[PDB]
Amino acid sequence: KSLSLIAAHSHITGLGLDENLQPRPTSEGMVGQLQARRAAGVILKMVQNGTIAGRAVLVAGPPSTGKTALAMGVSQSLGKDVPFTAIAGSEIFSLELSKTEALTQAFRKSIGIKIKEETELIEGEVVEIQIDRSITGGHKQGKLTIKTTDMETIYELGNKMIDGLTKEKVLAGDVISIDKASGKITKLGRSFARSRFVQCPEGELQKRKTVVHTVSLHEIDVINSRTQGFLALFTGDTGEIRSEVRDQINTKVAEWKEEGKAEIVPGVLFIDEVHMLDIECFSFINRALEDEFAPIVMMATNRGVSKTRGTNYKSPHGLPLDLLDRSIIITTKSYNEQEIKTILSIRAQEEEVELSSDALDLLTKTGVETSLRYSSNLISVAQQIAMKRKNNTVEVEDVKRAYLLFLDSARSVKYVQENESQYIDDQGNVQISIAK
Amino acid sequence: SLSLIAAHSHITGLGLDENLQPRPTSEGMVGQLQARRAAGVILKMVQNGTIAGRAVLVAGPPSTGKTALAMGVSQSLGKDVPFTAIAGSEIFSLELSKTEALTQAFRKSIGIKIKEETELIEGEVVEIQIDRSITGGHKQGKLTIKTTDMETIYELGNKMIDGLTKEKVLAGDVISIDKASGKITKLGRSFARSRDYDAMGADTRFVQCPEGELQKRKTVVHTVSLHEIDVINSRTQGFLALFTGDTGEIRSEVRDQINTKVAEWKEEGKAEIVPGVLFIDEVHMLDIECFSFINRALEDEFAPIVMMATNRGVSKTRGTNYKSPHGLPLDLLDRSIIITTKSYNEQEIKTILSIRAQEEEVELSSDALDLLTKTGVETSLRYSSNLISVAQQIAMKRKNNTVEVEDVKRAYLLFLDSARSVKYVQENESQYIDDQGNVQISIAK
Amino acid sequence: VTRTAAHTHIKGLGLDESGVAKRVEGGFVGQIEAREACGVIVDLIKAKKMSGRAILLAGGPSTGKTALALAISQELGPKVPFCPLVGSELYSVEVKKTETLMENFRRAIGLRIKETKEVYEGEVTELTPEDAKTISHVIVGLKSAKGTKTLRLDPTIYESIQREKVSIGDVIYIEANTGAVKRVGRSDAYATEFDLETEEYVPLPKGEVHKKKEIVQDVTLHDLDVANARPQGGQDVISMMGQLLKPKKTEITEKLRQEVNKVVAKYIDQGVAELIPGVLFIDEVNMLDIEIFTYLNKALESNIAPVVVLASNRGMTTVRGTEDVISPHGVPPDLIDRLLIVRTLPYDKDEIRTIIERRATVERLQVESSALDLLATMGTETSLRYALQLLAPCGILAQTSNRKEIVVNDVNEAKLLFLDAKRSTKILETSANYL
Amino acid sequence: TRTAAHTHIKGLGLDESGVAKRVEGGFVGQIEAREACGVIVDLIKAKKMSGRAILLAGGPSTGKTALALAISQELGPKVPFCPLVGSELYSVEVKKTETLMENFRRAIGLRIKETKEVYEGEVTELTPEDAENPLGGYGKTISHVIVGLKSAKGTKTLRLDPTIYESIQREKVSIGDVIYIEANTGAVKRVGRSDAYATEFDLETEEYVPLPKGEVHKKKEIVQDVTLHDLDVANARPQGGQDVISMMGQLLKPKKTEITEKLRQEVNKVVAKYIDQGVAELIPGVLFIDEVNMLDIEIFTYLNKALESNIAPVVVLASNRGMTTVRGTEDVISPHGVPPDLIDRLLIVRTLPYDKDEIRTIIERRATVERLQVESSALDLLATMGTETSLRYALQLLAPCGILAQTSNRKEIVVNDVNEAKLLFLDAKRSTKILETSANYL
Amino acid sequence: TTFGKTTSKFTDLIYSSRNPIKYSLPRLIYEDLILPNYNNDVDIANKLKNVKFNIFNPSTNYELCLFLSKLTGEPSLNEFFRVSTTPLLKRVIERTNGPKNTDSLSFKTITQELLEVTRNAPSEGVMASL
Ligand SMILES: Nc1ncnc2c1ncn2[C@@H]1O[C@H](COP(=O)(O)OP(=O)(O)O)[C@@H](O)[C@H]1O
Ligand SMILES: Nc1ncnc2c1ncn2[C@@H]1O[C@H](COP(=O)(O)OP(=O)(O)O)[C@@H](O)[C@H]1O
Ligand SMILES: Nc1ncnc2c1ncn2[C@@H]1O[C@H](COP(=O)(O)OP(=O)(O)O)[C@@H](O)[C@H]1O
Ligand SMILES: Nc1ncnc2c1ncn2[C@@H]1O[C@H](COP(=O)(O)OP(=O)(O)O)[C@@H](O)[C@H]1O
């Protein structure tokens, strides 16, 4: 389940918080940033309460300060069965959808409906199957013996059950699941009988089982529109769904909640790099947040006073002031030496790399000096240099060798700036020849 | 009825005599005693139909009556003559070229007239008897068709029976049969057989049983534009493209073929050409490519008469970097004659306001109408025209039948024109978002 | 249970019978003149006589323009169509922007049809077709818990029955007018014919076979336009898998529109349909190009145009698509002649305090007096929206300390945790690299 | 009769092997351009050269378009002529290169002659003759089919193949129908029903056609004219089969596609093969692109490429610019808006503006064609307008003068009629003077 | 695929191939949005939008049908109502080559009379080879 090699945020299992929403210094893979974690815990409580809608928050700070780490912590603390959509700023610039339509689809993907239904099921291990044919074979008679670990029974079959058993061959000793009302029979496997391999089911054979469904508003939006089927949820060409089906879906969902047949589960939409949206997207986002079925929007940006896209002026955070008026802003700060070394030790534990104390100190020094991501990339590349000399622990010499082999930002700018005759400039001039 | 009181629906035709002399106020139009005469000359030029492909230009300040003049020409043109009214922004299409959209708008304004003579047998079917020969190649038929008054018996051919087996007809079915063309339609089911089946179905409909004679003779005249023939002769099932707009850059070869076909039909004598008027409101926002195509597309024999309206002075033509008079290049202005509209005085504004208040069922006092006339001299005319309609509702909120001075004063207080909005914006410019995006939301500094 | 999103304390304009507005009634505080002008416009809409009336309401940000348009929508009632819109939505990659404007215009004119629902439901007891090969009629006997009832049927409904594979003993659903046939399932009394079968068993209906109900259908003109202009073809009732070709939005010809108008007028003349004109509302009108602004001039002169309401917060701003045109509110001077402008005023301290108290009441929160004074001072110092957004984290921080009433300390912690735009810009200015 | 800005020009107006006279073919003046255009007509009629470009240049309203239609009139209706505007090439379906190549291929015509052997007439009898010894397991084994035909002054019975019986049964041919039998392929088809059976049934849905004239059997040589673009779009469109894709594309919107060079190559080789047999004949025509100042430089480079082909026609361009930048380039100042690489490939013909007498004669002939009678002093006044404001402004102010004359119940156009026409309709100069001296937000 | 496989006088071979990806849908959405019942109006609105307010209905818009019949040449006036209410795949399957009357405005293009000659034409003909 959920195959993954190692992620860059794989150590974050949530927000480290107490029962009084106080952040521990080291919990759940998150260290430091006490005020930002407290604010994100308040936002998490806002989402889990579910009584308010359409509030936008902004996580702003310098680069490499843990904004995406905060978003991943909120997403892991939400758990399953709550919608979480994560998009980038450049994702909505489509050739087949308008920008407002893509933003609308991303908005309605983040709110879901919890529907609870029950179905009656058959589960057991097949003992013996008899199919009988007549002289002409016009009618078919049958008997099926099926057992669990507690009972055993024999059923008399009709024509459509016999046809459904002949199709998708079922032999003796197979564990199968039968849905009577739909006629779908699945082979769970084979029982443990030497004389795939699953165990024989226990308890009753006729079980009424309850399955809790959660379906987003965008799925019912696609299915209710007749212009395409449910295969557009996978192929991805929905093609500018009309508004009137969305008002029908809104009214139907409202009366479903009134009757008690459904519950509304709002979620979080996360927009990473929100400064790359046009001003039309910002103006749509301003008026899309006052709807009753609107999620809580999280935006993350790292710019200063920069040019807003599609305009000719400059704005704080790259966003216009009317969008910033409806936002509450969480500010992240830079890290210390101890926080950097704790981050590097946690990244060592997740990458299964054993480090010396001196190697950790050198990594902390070069991480304070250059970048946190540079040391977090150097630590995994030092282990291969250590393993080429056939030893397990990563020492100082491996870190110095990796620091010599792989450059960083400021050093690369420094070697470029006194060798610029060999590189292609903004004017397209270069010197390739060695002499003259 | 599906029409409400529009902006200018008092204008019913051009107010002219037989000698092309405009009356001071007749059939909706007040004043403009030279533009109305020029538009009457243009109307006679259209109604003669002997010349083709000539463009006129209606230039003047805003709120003067250019589109009022176009509406007058449209209403006095009469029916069965094509009149296309488009804007300059319509032709910028994602799925059509600008030149192709211009060609479609040109060919939507010239049509031909086709005369059809019908012999209809509309009645209820009583019984169908089918008789076959010994060989069985052909089938004979007996039809008993019944009206409220009389009933007779007809015969059928083999193709009649084949067409009648499709769109399956039983007893109690209202059909109509053409003698000359053999057209078959199923009108629906009679109301006399509406109590037997007990449940309707999807494809059925109930119509009344017809009365009168069975065989009725009637002639029909159809007016078909050239664009309709272009769309029909471009695909297998082309009428859906007529109603959905997915024609998609019809080739020139079928247009030349249709032009030769129309010339052949005119020479033989089963059709005659009815030319029309194309009206392009706000022509100044057209590309230089569009102006070039309009220049070279007016020299064809099947070209309508083009009316363009502009309220721009010496502005910059779109698609270029220089400025030209009326926002149009000099090559198009060489191929034009210009009708100039001039602004009004107090009396013409008074008469126009009285006519507009007469149409909206609004009773004004003399002093209230004088106040509205003074406001229309100071501000624009349309501000007073809208003030009439809101002061009417202010009057019924006071339980009064006719409006007074107080209702016009209250409507002046509650609603603002352009100059007062500019003034209150300019004296509080810190509360509004400027071109650089700066604004102040907090009220305390 | 109950959700709240920036509104829903706004219930109406809060006017008396004379058209005058009270101070605090209907969820609105302040702004008497704009509310009274909007009530006059609501009366004009209810008169149902004029077409192409354009109103612009202008003011600063967070002054109450969208609340006024929402109050218009609540005052008109659910019967009148209301089509809210943002100006950025008129740009699409499928059709041109003028066609999208035409569709949004025609979405604001509605119709009301009075229809009757007639339903036969029960267990099939007899199914006897007969030849007149072509069957002339079939006789179906239905059974419920309150008796049985037999029906004659046309052969088309028998064809639809043969589509659904209906046998003796199935519970079916027949609609008399449309002719739709739905198979609910096999009846519960026939459930022990086999020990195991692929058929679902449903009980008998406990009511009568015959059911009669009067309903009202509300459609708009745009629904008829898109129903009459399917390019691929008429879709069936049920298509779980998609169409083989993707149907794309097209440029609907005005000939189709005039045919729809002719058919609708013919049905109106027979007393079947009722015409309900409505309101088209375009928020952030300064985001329109000049070509849409030119097309609005001709679109307002039609005979079936609705009442159009526009909003803007800009000052003397360049119109989009132009470079040397400066106009008030970002609206070009050719179009600004055609409207009536309603001015909207900023608020004072006491109005801000009353708004904050009303928002705390609707969100089911209790606040102290000193917390209310601090929140009012913060609202006057930063913005009105900041205190409204900060009200709910104050409630959460009061909840985590096991209390039900917000005090000054929770407001101080919420002010510490979350910033406004001014303090964020102050941090942005005095920073080394990118905040 | 409809007149639209033209149709008073009938050819150029030269004599044989000599100078064009001043009064001929509706042309006044422009003698050197008429002689050069006559030399161009002789070059086209020589049917030798390919890819020759001619640009005619001059001021507005000088007679460039009139010279192009004079070229088309002098060549004849059989030679193809494709008039073009420079804005027509920008399309939203294909690239402008493909549109230029399609209009390039539209200007080459092909003359194909063919001999048809036919068999038509009313069906008299229709008898599938049985064989002498039938095979087992079958019924009605046809040995041959006897069909009798009937036309005007002719009656002939035919012995046919057994395999046309399926063609009889598909087209539903019965006795009394009039059919059409091609000789070599068989492949009968129903023209309709005979006119003698029109009163057979009271009500029917059939098409009764007169009985055909002439003999039943005849040999007719049919000469057909198609262009190469028709051959390209017929060969690109797949031949009518039973696949769902072909009939789906028939039922859908016919979007244009980029025709490959391979198909044009095969079309050229099969056309040259049948030209070498003495059957087909190639007729090159004229592609006239007017106001070529509006073309992008990519189209100019593709014109440079496509003028070197073997099958190219003669292309005529026209422009009214002087020193103007080429579109798509910010600094290439070039004569007539044409880049200098193309200008080297073409010859330039110069057109000169007119005088008082030429304007007066042109106005007189336009009034003659428009069926109006103008008094001589009114003609002198109109010539004064023509030399004072514009020739075209004088030409468009003839029909309102006739309308104002018919309003006053006169068939003569006189001085006060054209004074009222001055007063009612303005030209560009007075409109500009009104625009410059008015500040009422105009 | 996830088909019915054997975990080892005739043998039955039935097509049983499925997709491993399963999309689950609740019964409430289907039964309350897609199927007609007493408390919804799927069939009523379908009839209202497809039959009563259709512009090709000859019981209410006979003039348009007669106009289109003169334009195209269809012998039946119910042809347009049948074309507009059936899907494109069903239209292109059961399409027949029915005859049309000559007195119409739809005549034959040049490309069509080129293509209709060479349906059964043999080789060595000039028009067939071209
Ligand atoms: N407080 C923290 N606790 C644990 N890991 C952190 C913390 N802050 C940053 N990181 C790690 O640092 C790396 C880079 O930080 P990132 O969140 O990508 O920066 P930004 O906020 O600019 O996106 C990530 O892998 C993240 O897991
Ligand atoms: N001659 C006229 N007679 C009556 N009403 C007029 C006249 N000219 C203009 N109007 C009124 O002025 C209003 C707007 O004028 P309009 O025709 O739009 O001027 P323009 O076309 O120059 O913008 C119209 O509603 C019309 O009722
Ligand atoms: N007079 C008022 N009474 C109560 N609430 C108001 C009032 N004016 C504005 N508001 C509130 O202010 C919030 C933002 O106002 P908004 O409608 O967005 O103004 P604008 O659209 O001009 O920005 C809304 O949630 C609204 O409830
Ligand atoms: N030499 C000529 N003889 C007769 N008519 C002419 C002559 N030159 C120009 N014209 C007339 O002048 C009108 C406009 O000329 P046009 O072809 O538009 O010139 P250009 O192509 O230079 O713009 C045409 O209607 C044409 O009949």
Residue numbers in the entry:
A (entry chain U): 15 to 209, 220 to 460
B (entry chain Y): 16 to 460
C (entry chain T): 21 to 152, 161 to 463
D (entry chain X): 22 to 463
E (entry chain Q): 1029 to 1036, 1069 to 1190
Show the paper's wording.
Unlike other chromatin remodelers, INO80 preferentially mobilizes hexasomes, which can form during transcription. Here, we report cryogenic-electron microscopy (cryo-EM) structures of endogenously purified S. cerevisiae INO80 bound to a hexasome and a nucleosome. We group subunits of the INO80 complex into four modules: Rvb module (Rvb1/Rvb2), Arp8 module (Arp8/Arp4/Actin/Ies4 and Taf14), Ino80 module (Ino80/Ies2) and Arp5 module (Arp5/Ies6). The Ino80 protein consists of three major regions: the N-terminal domain (NTD), the HSA region (Ino80HSA) and the ATPase domain (Ino80ATPase).
While the INO80 architecture appears similar to that in the INO80-nucleosome structures, a major difference is that it is rotated ~180° on a hexasome compared to a nucleosome. On a hexasome, INO80 places its ATPase subunit, Ino80, at superhelical location (SHL)-2, across from SHL-6/−7 as previously seen on nucleosomes. When INO80 binds to a hexasome, the Arp5/Ies6 regions used in the context of a nucleosome are repurposed for different interactions. We observe that Ino80ATPase engages the hexasome predominantly near SHL −2. The placement of Ino80ATPase near SHL-2 is consistent with how the ATPase subunits of other remodelers bind the nucleosome. A site-specific gap at SHL-2 substantially inhibits INO80’s sliding of hexasomes (~2000 fold) while a gap near SHL-6 does not have a major effect. We further propose that the new contacts made by the Arp5/Ies6 module with the exposed H3-H4 surface provide an anchor allowing the Ino80 motor to efficiently pump DNA through the hexasome. These findings also explain the differential effects of the Arp5/Ies6 module on hexasome versus nucleosome sliding.
